[PDB]
Amino acid sequence: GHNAKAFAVAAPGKMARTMQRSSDVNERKLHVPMVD
Amino acid sequence: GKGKPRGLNSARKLRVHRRNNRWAENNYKKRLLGTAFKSSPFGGSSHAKGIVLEKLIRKCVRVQLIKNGKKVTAFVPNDGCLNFVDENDEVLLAGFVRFKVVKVSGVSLLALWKEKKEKPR
Amino acid sequence: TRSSVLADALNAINNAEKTGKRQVLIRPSSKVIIKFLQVMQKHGYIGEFEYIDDHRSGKIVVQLNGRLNKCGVISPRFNVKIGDIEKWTANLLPARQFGYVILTTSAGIMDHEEARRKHVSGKILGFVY
Amino acid sequence: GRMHSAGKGISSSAIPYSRNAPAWFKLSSESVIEQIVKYARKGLTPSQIGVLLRDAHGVTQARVITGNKIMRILKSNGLAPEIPEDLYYLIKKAVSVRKHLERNRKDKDAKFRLILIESRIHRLARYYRTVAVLPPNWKYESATASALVN
RNA sequence: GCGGUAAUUCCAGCUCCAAUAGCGUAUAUUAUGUUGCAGUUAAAAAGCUCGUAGUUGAACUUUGGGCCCGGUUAACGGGGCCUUUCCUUCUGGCUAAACCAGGACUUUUACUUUGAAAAAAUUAGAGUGUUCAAAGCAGGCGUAUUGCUCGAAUAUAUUAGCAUGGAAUAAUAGAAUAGGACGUUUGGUUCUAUUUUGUUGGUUUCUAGGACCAUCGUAAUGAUUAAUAGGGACGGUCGGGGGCAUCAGUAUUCAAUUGUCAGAGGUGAAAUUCUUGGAUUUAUUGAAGACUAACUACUGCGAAAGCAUUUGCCAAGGACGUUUUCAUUAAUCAAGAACGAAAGUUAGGGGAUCGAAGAUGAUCAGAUACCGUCGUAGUCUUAACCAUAAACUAUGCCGACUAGGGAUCGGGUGGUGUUUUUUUAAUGACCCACUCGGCACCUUACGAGAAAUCAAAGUCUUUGGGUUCUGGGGGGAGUAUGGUCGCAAGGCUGAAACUUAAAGGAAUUGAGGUUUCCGUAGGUGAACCUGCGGAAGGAUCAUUA
RNA sequence: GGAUAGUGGCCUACCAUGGUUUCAACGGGUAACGGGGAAUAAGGGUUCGAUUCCGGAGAGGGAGCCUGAGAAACGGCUACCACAUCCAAGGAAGGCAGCAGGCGCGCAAAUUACCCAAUCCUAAUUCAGGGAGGUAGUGACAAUAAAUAACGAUACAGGG
């Protein structure tokens, strides 16, 4: 389709730390499903 | 002598050559594309929430992850605390069987092993 | 082709000193090679050199008497500021009580210590120890 | 070594360490000038004036005797051609090999050598047009080169 | 009860150790190369050459000497003079175009020094007992009843712009058709007047300042070498370099004719096959296409692929020799382009041999000793394509230096050296010595390397001559998508998701089949077989020299 | 020429065909506000900088405007889009990326506190106002100093 080189960003480390913290926040929302 | 040019007015060639060549390094590519955390078992996270699916060898349990849905094995330290997880428990796991049980039902396993807290049911 | 006659002269001097020769011949000649060899000769790293005059470029025969470790050029001739001299000195010399780096400044071709004493800086040319 | 070959030969002449007056000559200093221009009027380009002058009349070079080069002497009297000597001979060789290639279409060695000769002509013509002895464009092409050389 | 347990130690008790108002855990990270990586074999030098931009590029033009003053520890550093040397644009004076006080200048740059500047906080840092400290900018001293007083420094700021000193280093321009510089050498054109003839409008002369056209001079009147760089010319060589034409040599197959009998081929052992209309063999002759044996070598030529019969023609080339020419024209190379084994593709040609596919023989534990006959395309060529190889020296190209020896190819130099002339004169061949340019070889380590090994794979932890290309674990994979080229086959570019950590590799020493591959084409038992071309990443003994 | 506070293809009528680029134009991506600064280094580099200061932009998303020296202002106005409040069903009203505070998962994180005393800002103005700002409260962000003991007598174990 296209190249992964072209769809890149200006800051690697900020992506790394914000993405790790956002993954932690997103897995904080997970639960065991039951019925209301 | 060496492969690289060494002119006074040849900084452009060196900079362009370095820019071209850094893409062949694995760390550079996986840190610019943001896909370096898919090789980790957790994904981008450091802990993963899971469902206690079965009690397994004797110390470990079989726990299904809630995010992706695949089932792994979990290490429960202080083998007596094996009986704190019962069935379908909501656990929070960290890497160590490459996994281990850290936080069961919101509270930590060290607060239950030392009888600091009690499990909310 | 020949891009720097000073590099060839210093490579010939280094090889002649390493194999253990007493004197070496250098072709072509230059004013910069003559001045650089005088800068070596003042601190005794070489012996005595003589200029043979054919009409083409001249040749230089240098009589060596030991106590030469390593001499070379730094190509390209970078622009070295007056605070930047000790950076090169620490980068490409073995110690501090021996070893000279050599600069062509607007006051001529001289080693780094005379450049400090005259408070003048310019382009790098090479080194000797 | 060579510009268009792997050869690295050093076969050349060695001019002596004497810029004035070979002692056994004692002939003249200006007679060689009209001898040279008579040879040029005969239809000769400066290389064989030099060769025939050192082979027959004993002049080692015109620089040491007359104090002037042969091409500057011929240009001083207005006998210089439009194109210089070596470019003329390169165009002549290219025209001959192009005629041969026109007769023989399957001579790929002649193709390669024609490309080499034409690139050499391009380099020398660029140098001549930079120093401005040629017209500033001069447009080298084979169709006009065939009429230009002969 | 003992011992063992792929219990990746299964669990509790005693003891000690680390840090401490703090300590642990999970995940991420630390312990690409300008400086400063590697490319023979571990990943990697485009198959080769040309070539634009880019990057890089031989030497050379004022050095040397004397004089003082003159700052700092006999030394280091500064300026003015003279040594043919201080060069320019003008106001005021000493004067008789030649000096003094003064307003200013890199022909154009790059470079470097110095200075203005550049915001506070932050950084470094001076002073100061906030009870110490992190800090903060405070504070300190007295007759402590009318007071006094030190501070709140300093450094840095790495580009671009501004000012300034230097002129090495690296570029650029000037006099070659003199259309060049300089003048109390003269005429003419063309313009403007700060004025005086009362201010002004216009007419003119004188006078003053410019530019221009021709003539007399003033002068050392103006051109750096000619790179063991390059291209060009010339002399004689040299070669299995190329194209066209032509000639020859056996051989293979086929055909004709003649001889004679029972077999000929083939393989480990058979069979199909031809054969008493004569197979095979023998003898004479002819045709077809292909290929150039022996000579053939650790020889030669070409950019590589590659190139071997004779002779002729056409154009080309290397090395040598030259007291020949021009004077930097050069090196490497994105764009772009020429050539490019074999196989393969579209047409025309003849098609001998060999021969993928195919048709057929027997499959006998063992095929170790997996074959036989016929044979299409192809093999050869013309006109167009394709553009890949273990395209290998697995070693880019240009330049220099560094170690001993013997051969050998081409050119050149010397030999009251040899031989053939039929007279010992040129030449040819041989020998000896030297030299330039090659193909390689033997030993060694000055060195290099992880090692095998290397005269470069050396001149490197003491690291810089210029330049191009490539690589940054292995599969997935040169696969998928997109683009471009190709009639196709396919070529160029070129990923990711997932997976391995007892994973991939380089060199050396401690039931059957078994050479390993590469480019290409075709077909299926057992991921194999076969056709063309290429490599060793495979183990040179005996004789002679 | 119009318009502007004013230059200007800012816009209009006419006339030319130009302008940029392999020294990378143009298009695309950016989890891209920029700088002072921060960290790791011996140096070069590499990474971060939403955030105490300076500059820019925005006030749910477009678009337009009044007033005024200064706004294309949103704790100003008008209309469109999306949300959304009130009711007697005719109509009216809205904008926390200000300070508190709440929702956004059924797995969680500061006080809907006090005051203009300080620093400054505003006005007609010493006087009023200021969730700007200060004060206290609150999860060990980070950081500094520092308690939880010191001196003995007696019996054994010692070096003796």
Side-chain angles (χ1 to χ4, degrees):
Chain A
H2 55 68
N3 48 345
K5 275 79 174 177
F7 300 94
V9 302
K14 160 182 177 162
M15 184 180 288
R17 64 173 284 265
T18 52
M19 152 176 178
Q20 193 161 260
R21 189 187 185 270
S22 76
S23 295
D24 269 351
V25 162
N26 287 342
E27 64 93 21
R28 201 182 299 125
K29 298 200 172 313
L30 261 52
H31 303 312
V32 169
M34 51 215 68
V35 296
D36 290 327
Chain B
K2 292 193 175 84
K4 55 185 94 83
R6 282 174 180 167
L8 258 183
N9 291 294
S10 73
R12 172 174 278 127
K13 187 67 156 282
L14 302 170
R15 177 176 51 82
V16 167
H17 189 245
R18 189 51 74 232
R19 222 182 58 222
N20 289 334
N21 275 279
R22 285 183 314 230
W23 280 113
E25 174 177 16
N26 205 51
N27 197 310
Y28 184 87
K29 210 178 204 223
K30 295 300 177 186
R31 84 154 184 193
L32 280 196
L33 272 298
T35 51
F37 293 146
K38 268 75 182 174
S39 71
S40 75
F42 285 140
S45 173
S46 66
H47 294 73
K49 274 182 118 192
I51 297 169
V52 175
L53 171 83
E54 197 263 352
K55 295 213 203 144
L56 303 174
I57 306 300
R58 182 178 177 180
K59 185 183 287 185
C60 301
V61 293
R62 204 180 80 241
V63 169
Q64 153 194 353
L65 310 180
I66 307 172
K67 183 176 73 68
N68 55 7
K70 67 182 290 294
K71 323 175 178 87
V72 292
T73 59
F75 192 93
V76 177
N78 290 318
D79 212 323
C81 312
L82 183 63
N83 67 352
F84 284 138
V85 285
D86 310 329
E87 268 293 326
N88 303 8
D89 300 75
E90 189 196 19
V91 286
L92 185 69
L93 302 183
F96 190 48
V97 178
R98 330 282 194 283
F99 294 77
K100 83 180 189 169
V101 181
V102 175
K103 284 230 297 169
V104 55
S105 290
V107 306
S108 54
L109 266 179
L110 281 72
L112 314 176
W113 168 54
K114 287 166 138 158
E115 292 83 3
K116 304 269 200 191
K117 294 181 176 67
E118 301 216 20
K119 195 153 91 83
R121 261 151 201 179
Chain C
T1 78
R2 297 186 148 275
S3 63
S4 193
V5 293
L6 186 61
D8 283 88
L10 299 191
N11 167 262
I13 289 175
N14 278 269
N15 274 342
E17 171 66 341
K18 276 156 125 175
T19 70
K21 307 296 191 293
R22 195 164 93 266
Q23 65 182 177
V24 70
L25 171 153
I26 289 162
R27 176 198 67 95
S29 179
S30 288
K31 284 184 304 190
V32 60
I33 302 186
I34 284 299
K35 296 271 179 263
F36 192 81
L37 269 288
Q38 295 167 16
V39 172
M40 304 202 183
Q41 186 196 46
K42 186 199 309 174
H43 313 281
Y45 283 108
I46 65 163
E48 153 183 350
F49 56 99
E50 183 178 1
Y51 168 76
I52 301 155
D53 179 76
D54 53 357
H55 292 307
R56 276 70 174 175
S57 304
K59 296 179 202 194
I60 303 167
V61 175
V62 190
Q63 282 106 41
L64 314 171
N65 42 31
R67 74 175 66 86
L68 199 149
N69 268 8
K70 168 78 189 296
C71 68
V73 301
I74 303 299
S75 280
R77 308 191 173 134
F78 297 100
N79 299 306
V80 180
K81 285 190 166 60
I82 192 166
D84 204 6
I85 296 173
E86 67 272 15
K87 298 212 71 203
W88 282 99
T89 284
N91 262 343
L92 61 83
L93 291 175
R96 51 206 177 277
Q97 70 272 16
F98 63 93
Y100 284 62
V101 302
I102 295 173
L103 312 184
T104 178
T105 68
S106 84
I109 302 184
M110 61 205 98
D111 48 56
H112 72 278
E113 291 266 0
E114 184 178 1
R116 304 211 161 160
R117 204 171 331 101
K118 283 171 157 321
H119 202 71
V120 67
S121 169
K123 299 171 171 296
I124 203 170
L125 209 72
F127 66 101
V128 64
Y129 51 89
Chain D
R2 301 273 84 79
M3 199 185 73
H4 279 168
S5 165
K8 283 188 211 328
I10 63 168
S11 74
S12 70
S13 75
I15 307 102
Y17 186 75
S18 181
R19 278 173 177 167
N20 284 67
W24 45 263
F25 193 61
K26 56 173 170 299
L27 188 143
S28 173
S29 68
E30 61 77 15
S31 82
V32 190
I33 296 170
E34 72 285 357
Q35 193 55 340
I36 281 169
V37 308
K38 187 264 289 180
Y39 282 139
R41 286 202 261 274
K42 205 162 290 294
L44 283 72
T45 188
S47 45
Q48 63 265 16
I49 296 89
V51 176
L52 193 150
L53 183 63
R54 76 141 153 77
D55 267 22
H57 317 311
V59 175
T60 57
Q61 293 179 356
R63 253 191 291 131
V64 60
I65 298 298
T66 67
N68 222 325
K69 294 187 278 187
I70 295 94
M71 203 57 197
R72 281 157 58 193
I73 283 163
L74 296 200
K75 196 216 181 195
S76 178
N77 294 315
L79 277 80
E82 183 178 1
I83 48 169
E85 168 177 323
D86 44 359
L87 199 54
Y88 159 68
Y89 272 120
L90 274 163
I91 292 160
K92 192 170 91 160
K93 182 164 277 196
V95 159
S96 59
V97 72
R98 195 176 278 275
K99 184 189 288 184
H100 166 82
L101 201 43
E102 281 196 300
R103 270 200 308 125
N104 303 105
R105 315 203 49 80
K106 267 162 48 65
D107 210 310
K108 304 178 180 77
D109 190 13
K111 270 184 199 59
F112 186 79
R113 292 310 211 266
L114 172 59
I115 296 167
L116 296 188
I117 296 164
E118 287 202 300
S119 307
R120 200 175 297 132
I121 295 173
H122 279 93
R123 295 164 91 146
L124 193 66
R126 182 209 297 128
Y127 159 69
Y128 290 166
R129 84 167 68 113
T130 291
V131 69
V133 65
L134 294 188
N137 63 7
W138 195 78
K139 201 60 179 174
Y140 174 64
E141 181 46 15
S142 302
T144 190
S146 183
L148 188 136
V149 65
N150 73 281

